[PDB]
Amino acid sequence: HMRDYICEYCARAFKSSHNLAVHRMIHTGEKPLQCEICGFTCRQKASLNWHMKKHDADSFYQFSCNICGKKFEKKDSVVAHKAKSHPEV
Ligand SMILES: [Zn+2]
Ligand SMILES: [Zn+2]
Ligand SMILES: [Zn+2]
User: Looking at the CA of 85, which ligand is closest?
Assistant: First the structure.
């Protein structure tokens, strides 16, 4: 326990105070940026932002709806569906 940064209970072990602070978005006071779709947390706005785009029409795998996972033939069907069936998520 020297380079083993523990968040009392809810960190197994991090190697940097900032790494633990990335999780610590709940109790820290600063609050970094987590993907509100799943879990994936980062310091820079672009890194999670494009990872969220990965879920949108499912650029992460094949084709899905980020919001209700209806599953479509093409991303066009997803984006067309999301703009109509999700005005207020
Ligand atoms: Zn914690
Ligand atoms: Zn995500
Ligand atoms: Zn949907």
Answer: 3
